[PDB]
Amino acid sequence: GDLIQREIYLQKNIYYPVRSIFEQGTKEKKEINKKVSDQVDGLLKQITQGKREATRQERVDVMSAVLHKMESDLEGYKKTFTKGPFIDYEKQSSLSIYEAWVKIWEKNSWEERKKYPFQQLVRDELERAVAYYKQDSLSEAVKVLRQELNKQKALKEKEDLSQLERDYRTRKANLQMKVQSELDQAGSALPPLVSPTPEQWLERATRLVTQAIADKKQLQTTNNTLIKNSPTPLEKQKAIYNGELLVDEIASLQARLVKLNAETTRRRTEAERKAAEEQALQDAIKFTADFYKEVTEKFGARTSEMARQLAEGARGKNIRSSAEAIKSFEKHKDALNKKLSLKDRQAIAKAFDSLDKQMMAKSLEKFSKGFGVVGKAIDAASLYQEFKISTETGDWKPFFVKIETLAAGAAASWLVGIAFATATATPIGILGFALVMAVTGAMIDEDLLEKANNLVISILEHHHHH
Ligand SMILES: [Zn+2]
Ligand SMILES: [Zn+2]
Ligand SMILES: [Zn+2]
Ligand SMILES: [Zn+2]
Ligand SMILES: [Zn+2]
Ligand SMILES: [Zn+2]
Ligand SMILES: [Zn+2]
Ligand SMILES: [Zn+2]
């Protein structure tokens, strides 16, 4: 009724309660950030037990947990406030609030009003006034916590990137050794090789490097997609780094492949040279076999058989001493001087003078190879001259001395090569070739001298007369 009653009602039921709500509301908003910060720290101190400082992850985890609880309370208070219209309590008169409340109440029916009195609505509206200031302070508390949480997340991300850079630099440094270890790992899958030639293990190493290049290039195409479709900068930087590492590895592998290709070529060439050495040996054996045939063609069966027996009888023997040779040759000598004419001596001496040194040297290397005796140094012209002097004079003692000196400690077969090399480079004739074999034979074996000595005499079907 009375205007005093109305003023008492407005003060008691609207102004005095709302003002308290607003006072408590502002008190909470002033202390919320401090209380939120202290719950985070107090909880972090519980996890660590004040023995160590909390990790960035531990900080992010607690702050997120607290924020999720604050956001759910915010939604709750924001739902209650939502149920009615917006009244900015602090800026309204007690009459403004009253008329707003009356309008809300009037929305009901008369029967509704009997079950829900105005005083009941007043109670509900004051609960909604608390809800309004609760959601307002909580909205600010959430904005601050979300900003601090985000900063922490950013710091963590920066820290993760620093360790990613650290892992990369270390890996980058250990490049050469890493590729070697990777190739070995690939190599373990492979079965054992027995007595491998260098060309065999080079082929296997070339296969590992080639496949490692092929696989690393396939990983690079895959990694380019990983960079393009990255969900976070951390996952992108991981891919950027791995991609850099992959190019470094491929280049290391390619450098290795170049060396392998070069070495393989060196090995192949070497094997071709070795194979050409075995062919030269077989061609030397062919040349020795052909020499006997050619001798048969030009001098007949008996001279060739005498050359063949000279070569076979020298096998595994060494050269005798000049004294031995002089003694053996002096024994059978008398007949030779008497049955050998001056014209003969001159014909044999002349042949030796016409001797071709180049073809002689080439034949001696082939015969020496065929007999499997080492290549020996000789001044051929010196040797032949002494042979010629020895043919012209009756004296062979200075010949034997020259051969012993020239070939002391050598195989008897080398002398045979010298004998044979002479027949191929000189117009020596059947007689000269037989005397050469006789002289060579005295330096090897007594029975080889006797056999050749018989051939010389037998060859002397010359017309020696008046
Ligand atoms: Zn306000
Ligand atoms: Zn690697
Ligand atoms: Zn070949
Ligand atoms: Zn022929
Ligand atoms: Zn004898
Ligand atoms: Zn004669
Ligand atoms: Zn005659
Ligand atoms: Zn006579």
Numbering used by the authors: 40 to 505
According to the publication:
In addition to its C-terminal pore-forming domain, elongated PyoS5 comprises two novel tandemly repeated kinked 3-helix bundle domains that structure-based alignments identify as key import domains in other pyocins. The central domain binds the lipid-bound common polysaccharide antigen, allowing the pyocin to accumulate on the cell surface.
The protein crystallized in the P21 space group, and the structure was solved by a combination of single-wavelength anomalous diffraction and molecular replacement to a resolution of 2.2 Å. The first 39 residues were absent from the final model and presumed to be unstructured; we refer to this below as the “disordered region. The structure shows that PyoS5 is an elongated, α-helical protein measuring 36 Å on the short axis and 195 Å on the long axis. Domain 1 comprises residues 40 to 194, while domain 2 comprises residues 195 to 315. Moreover, over half of the 45 identical residues shared between pyocins S2, SD3, and S5 form a grooved surface that runs perpendicular to the long axis of PyoS5.
